[PDB]
Amino acid sequence: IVGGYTCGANTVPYQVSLNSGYHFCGGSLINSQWVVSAAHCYKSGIQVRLGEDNINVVEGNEQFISASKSIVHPSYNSNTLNNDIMLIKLKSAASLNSRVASISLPTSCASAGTQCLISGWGNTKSSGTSYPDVLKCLKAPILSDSSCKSAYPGQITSNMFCAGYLEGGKDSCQGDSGGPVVCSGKLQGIVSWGSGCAQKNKPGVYTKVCNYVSWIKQTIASN
Ligand SMILES: [Ca+2]
Numbered sequence: 421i422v423g424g425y426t427c428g429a430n431t432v433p434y435q436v437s438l439n440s441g442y443h444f445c446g447g448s449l450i451n452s453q454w455v456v457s458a459a460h461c462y463k464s465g466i467q468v469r470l471g472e473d474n475i476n477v478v479e480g481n482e483q484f485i486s487a488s489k490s491i492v493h494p495s496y497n498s499n500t501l502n503n504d505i506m507l508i509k510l511k512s513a514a515s516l517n518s519r520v521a522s523i524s525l526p527t528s529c530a531s532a533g534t535q536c537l538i539s540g541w542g543n544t545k546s547s548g549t550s551y552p553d554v555l556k557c558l559k560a561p562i563l564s565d566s567s568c569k570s571a572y573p574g575q576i577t578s579n580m581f582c583a584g585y586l587e588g589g590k591d592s593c594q595g596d597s598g599g600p601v602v603c604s605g606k607l608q609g610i611v612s613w614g615s616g617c618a619q620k621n622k623p624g625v626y627t628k629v630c631n632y633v634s635w636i637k638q639t640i641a642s643n
Pocket of ligand 1: 476
């Protein structure tokens with residue numbers, strides 16, 4: 421998160437860290453046994469860390485649970501990043517409480533102008549590299565599709581949407597991938613890609629979760 425602020429311990433209870441001996445991607449807890457993340461975050465041997473704040477220190481409330489299986493959308497294309505969504509089933513059910521809670525799936529696509537909360541432990545620098553210990557947050561608006569397609573000609577599909585600032589200075593970054601974009605208490609996006617970080621006229625691109633509600637529900641029901 422570039423140009424953001426410190427969320428505060430456990431203020432984003434649905435936020436998860438995907439770990440393989442180090443933090444590599446964010447994720448969202450949608451129920452006691454399932455996490456939604458980005459398909460490009462996939463890899464064998466994933467340990468989902470819940471209730472995290474400082475990801476380098478064990479301070480209480482954390483829950484480390486191994487992924488029993490990661491389900492990458494069958495139509496995910498690594499070259500275009502279309503269908504950048506992945507379902508992760510936990511080996512055992514997570515303990516839901518004040519610090520650890522699931523986020524609701526959307527019942528409709530959010531409209532442009534809607535304010536959303538983006539969060540993660542990704543890079544905080546536009547040019548350099550500086551990874552934070554504690555969870556960072558960012559309030560950003562969903563941009564219109566015309567502005568989005570204008571920023572990335574021929575790269576935006578119906579399964580993507582832009583969010584952020586065209587002036588630059590505020591955006592999600594490396595490490596934030598797979599993280600939640602929450603608007604009005606609903607998971608509308610997943611940190612997917614962009615051209616650099618917090619660069620002007622290059623807003624962040626996110627996976628349009630509202631286009632996958634049926635798929636998510638159907639996949640979960642058969643697994
Ligand atoms: Ca910790």
